[PDB]
Amino acid sequence: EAEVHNQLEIKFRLTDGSDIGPKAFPDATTVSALKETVISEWPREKENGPKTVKEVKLISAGKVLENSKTVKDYRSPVSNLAGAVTTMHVIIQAPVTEKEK
């Protein structure tokens, strides 16, 4: 790992107003890994809500984060320090009859 983990932290706030604790995410993190990160934080025991990768939508600035992009894509330039924390909305989109397997 890198010495002293001061990257830019993101926390996830669900559309219902509940939030998940912030984690440090390098700008070079892919949205794919970001999306994965959520799946690990999100209770798999949860019924009626996401829990698999495809179910959860990450939206920042009114833009859904495609996994094929990086966090850097939605971030500020290098002219910003690692003191900026980001709070991103998670919108709950439930599929019509679908659940893990």
Domain boundaries, the chain: 1-101
Q: Which of 71, 77, 45 is nearest to 58 (CA)?
A: 71
Q: Which of 19, 5, 2 is nearest to 82 (CA)?
A: 5
Q: Are 85 and 94 in contact (CB under 8 A)?
A: no
Experimental technique used to determine this entry: NMR
Q: What does R_g of the chain's alpha carbons equal in angstroms? A: 14
CATH architecture of 1-101: Roll (3.10)
Q: How far is CA 66 from CA 9, 10, 76, in A?
A: 19, 16, 17
Token digits for 68? 């094929």
Going by C-beta distance under 8 Å and a sequence separation of 6 or more, which residues neighbour residue 71? 8, 10, 25, 26, 27, 28, 29, 30, 31, 34
